[PDB]
Amino acid sequence: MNIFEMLRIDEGLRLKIYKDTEGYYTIGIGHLLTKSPSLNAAKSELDKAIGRNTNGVITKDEAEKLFNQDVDAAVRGILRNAKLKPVYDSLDAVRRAALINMVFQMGETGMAGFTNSLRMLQQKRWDEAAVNLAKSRWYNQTPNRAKRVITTFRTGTWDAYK
């Protein structure tokens, strides 16, 4: 198990534009195209991303390519973030994957409301952090996925995914 397999499980794979849990146009493995309500706008962002006229549909290869970029971007984003980096550097490899998944899902920006949890994670207070993580809109909206990530942070193993 690794970050890629883990997100592939959490996000699924779809080759035609779809709306995500928040109802925003997405494609591939969780690749957000835009928060705009315009499907047109969404097809335009997609062609721009793929570099071709796609007509709202991509191949598997293209989705994996977006996915690789997106994972990479998330990691770099973390390393560039003053509030996130220290946390990430303090974690073991499994837990680091858990932090990546969250960022990937939510954006660094939404990462700010998790300040207290982050501190607990840095202090290695696993159960406390697990409890604090669950009091969040994130948990209330996508409870099954949230449970898997939280378990991952709580145990430091991939059991929730196996």
Residue 159 CA to residue 162 CA, distance in Å, equals: 5
Phi, psi of 57 (to 5 degrees): -135, 140
Residues that bind Cl ion (CB under 5 A): 49, 142, 144-145
Question: Which residue's CB is nearer to Cl ion, number 53 or number 144?
Answer: 144
Does the annotation place 140 within a ligand binding site?
no
Minimum Å gap between C-beta 68 and Cl ion is 11
Exactly one of 20, 64, 108, 128 is catalytic; name it: 20
The radius of gyration computed from the CA coordinates of the chain, to the nearest angstrom, equals 16
Catalytic annotation on 128?
no
Residues ≥6 apart with Cβ < 8 Å to 57: 15, 16, 17
Does the annotation place 7 within a ligand binding site?
no
Residue 16, beta-bridge partner list: 57
Question: Which residue's CB is nearer to Cl ion, number 81 or number 142?
Answer: 142
Exactly one of 10, 11, 45, 70 is catalytic; name it: 11
Give residue 113's identity as a one-letter amino acid code.
G
Minimum Å gap between C-beta 40 and Cl ion is 18
Question: Which residue's CB is nearer to Cl ion, number 5 or number 89?
Answer: 5
Does the annotation place 114 within a ligand binding site?
no
Catalytic annotation on 11?
yes
Q: Based on the number of CB atoms within 10 Å of its own CB, is 52 exposed (0-12), middle (13-18) or buried (19 or more)?
A: exposed
Does the annotation place 133 within a ligand binding site?
no
Residue 128 CA to residue 116 CA, distance in Å, equals: 10
Active-site annotation, residues: 11, 20
Binding-site positions for substrate read 32, 104, 117, 132
Binding-site positions read 32, 104, 117, 132
